[PDB]
Specification:
Two copies of one chain form a homodimer.
Chain A lengths: L5 E5 L2 H13 L5 H13 L10 E7 L5 E8 L4 H11 L4 E3 H10 L10 H10 L2 E6 L5 E7 L20 E4 L3 E7 L1 H7 L1 H10 L4 H18 L9 E7 L4 E5 L6 E5 L2 E5 L2 E2 L3
Parallel strand pairs in A: 3-4, 10-13
Antiparallel strand pairs in A: 1-5, 1-11, 2-3, 2-6, 5-6, 7-8, 8-9, 9-10, 11-12
Helix pairs in contact in A: 1-2, 2-3, 7-8
């Protein structure tokens, strides 16, 4: 019954990323290298309100190793710095200036990440996640975000927070999130999806039930569901997959032995 | 049967901090105000070198602090790797209350704190600077008289870390998690392992499934123990403690290694209690 290898990633651009991941997966490479290669494609920034491009990234392998960078400047491939945090330090998360100092110490090159376009648009004003199961039956995941959308300097979203934007447990499954970062954080959304898979739900059931719990939280907070987007995509150990969101309009890319395509999740707000 | 108000906190110095939280709780005040007050006490004390003022610096001699706070209705705020502000729990509460964000780090966290009237101070004591020059956490959760849960987690740890390292203390779901329909939990110890397991979210989800607070803390520790072994690591090198409260005011705790105590204050009084540990 196992379907492998398989890779899922968020949004239309996930399709393009899935092609790079599959170059790894289809040759029997590791989930970890496939997700890193997939999200590097997309990395290759709308700034914060102070005109600074700051980037967040998280990576998690098949043996509970994790690396994360948040609010890092000047480095074009934060997913690879996250990988270096995982493999080369005893920490799991570095932020701000210290994530940059680390990246420099590992040979990453300092660059200007603000295009003169983005700068002009900023003067005027005044995410991908990927999860994969490889031919060995191992899971890994990666996520990265570059749009600060003129938020406050030092704002951190869900991408670099383990259990929010991404979560992987090699015995159970993996999940990655879409939508508003603050809402994914407050609900620990991808940890909830994986724990629901641990409790016997299929990836599809786990995504749906997580979204349904979150909908109730949004109501208890007196907020209007139209103003809140949260969704997830998920994989289990057998390569079943699922997706569900509060609102319609998201799609995600899935690549297995049937090839690559864009699919639409179920959604709660009818 | 409901035991409330009640407050729990991590480590021995939780006993004195609980007295401060109880000044709010015993008057019918809000759990959120009690946990802020309780942990601010430890942030203020230069002789408590794992929290706030007096904190051992990072390896380059900088005192960086992390904190987060969570109320009874999924409101959250966090600061991480913040310098020069004595009371990061209060800046976290201002992230929560005064911005559309839930977490600020680094210089942006400092700029915000000053924007809200917090004062730049020198957090490196003479004692901490010498231990450094030589060389080369409190979590609190409470159920108030109204039956609402809140929690707070604040730290300077870990000592001589790489600049920019963030542990579990300011991460919702790792260091702290509160759901007013289920329970609350907070963690301490080696932050990397609480992050890896999303420890407090797991404790609260175990309570959601029907585990007692103690059983939930115990199963969460056992997951870390499993993972430590799967990673080829040595359990002796690792300490993690969880404390938890459910909506009836039942409480429990568990840890990896002996030596972790927690403080619990309810209507019968304030007690230092010693939970079970995995490493036998």
């Amino acid at each position: 019954t196992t379907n492998k290898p398989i890779v899922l990633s968020t949004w239309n651009f996930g399709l393009h990323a899935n092609v790079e991941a599959w170059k790894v997966l289809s040759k029997g490479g590791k989930a970890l290298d496939a997700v890193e290669k997939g999200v590097r494609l997309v990395e290759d920034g709308r700034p914060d309100r102070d005109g600074r491009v700051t980037l967040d990234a998280c990576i998690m392998d098949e043996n509970y190793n994790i690396g994360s960078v948040a609010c890092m400047e000047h480095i074009k491939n934060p997913i690879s710095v996250a990988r270096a945090v995982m493999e080369k330090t005893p920490h799991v998360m570095l932020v701000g200036d210290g994530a940059l100092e680390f990246a420099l110490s590992q040979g990453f090159k300092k660059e200007n990440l603000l295009t003169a376009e983005s700068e002009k648009e900023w003067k005027e004003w005044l995410t991908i996640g990927m999860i994969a199961l490889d031919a060995q039956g191992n899971l890994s995941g990666a996520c990265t975000t570059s749009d600060m959308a003129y938020k406050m300097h030092g704002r951190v979203g869900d991408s670099p927070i383990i259990g929010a934007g991404l979560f992987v447990d090699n015995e159970i499954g993996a999940a990655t999130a879409t939508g508003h970062g603050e809402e994914v954080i407050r609900t620990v959304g991808t940890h909830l999806v994986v724990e629901l898979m641990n409790q016997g739900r299929t990836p599809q059931q786990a995504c749906k039930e997580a979204v349904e719990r979150i909908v109730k939280i949004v109501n208890r907070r007196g907020k209007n569901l139209k103003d809140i987007q949260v969704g997830f995509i998920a994989l289990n150990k057998k390569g079943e997959y699922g997706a569900y969101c509060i609102q319609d309009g998201f799609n995600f890319a899935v690549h297995d032995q049937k090839g690559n395509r864009l699919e639409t999740p179920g959604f709660a707000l009818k």
